[PDB]
Amino acid sequence: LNNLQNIIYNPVIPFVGTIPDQLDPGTLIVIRGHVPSDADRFQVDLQNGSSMKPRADVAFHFNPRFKRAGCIVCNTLINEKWGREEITYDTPFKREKSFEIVIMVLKDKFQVAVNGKHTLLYGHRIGPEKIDTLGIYGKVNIHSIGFSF
Ligand SMILES: OC[C@H]1O[C@@H](O[C@H]2[C@H](O)[C@@H](O)[C@H](O)O[C@@H]2CO)[C@H](O)[C@@H](O)[C@H]1O
Numbered sequence: 001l002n003n004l005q006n007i008i009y010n011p012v013i014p015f016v017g018t019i020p021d022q023l024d025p026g027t028l029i030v031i032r033g034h035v036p037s038d039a040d041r042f043q044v045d046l047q048n049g050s051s052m053k054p055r056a057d058v059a060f061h062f063n064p065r066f067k068r069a070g071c072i073v074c075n076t077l078i079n080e081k082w083g084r085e086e087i088t089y090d091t092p093f094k095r096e097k098s099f100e101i102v103i104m105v106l107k108d109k110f111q112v113a114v115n116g117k118h119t120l121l122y123g124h125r126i127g128p129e130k131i132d133t134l135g136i137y138g139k140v141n142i143h144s145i146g147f148s149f
């Protein structure tokens with residue numbers, strides 16, 4: 001890390017907020033918090049705007065789910081239609097456990113690590129320059145949101 005500057009502490013979920021700079025290659029988004037014991041799922045959405053009707057495009061939907069053995073669904077929403085799901089079954093998330101999510105923006109893809117260990121990759125389907133909004137929804141508690149540009 002270093003260069004990480006945390007804004008937003010303990011936001012009310014759902015949280016929707018504008019990202020303070022363009023997500024150029026090398027940028028980090030760092031989200032710390034924990035999963036409550038009654039959690040079915042939560043999501044971190046990198047969005048093109050904050051429109052609700054029509055629902056803003058989600059360039060990167062990062063969606064841990066905890067039913068059964070749990071997983072992480074990643075996907076992209078365009079014109080309120082979901083695309084092809086990229087499912088990661090080796091999920092490090094567990095109910096009643098803390099996490100640090102680090103999303104690293106590369107030229108061709110996102111690289112995501114959780115609690116210091118690599119978790120997944122997701123190739124860009126929308127140009128990252130169109131991402132200006134971070135949403136966090138569902139059953140999750142967030143201590144901090146920060147960025148490293
Ligand atoms: O793709 C993310 C999107 O998934 C929706 O649910 C899917 C589900 O993940 C898939 O495995 C199942 O087979 O069909 C559903 C069809 O939409 C969620 O409703 C949505 O919240 C997004 O998370």
Ligand code: NA
């Ligand atoms: Na959704």
Ligand code: NI
Binds near residue numbers: 034143
């Ligand atoms: Ni805590």
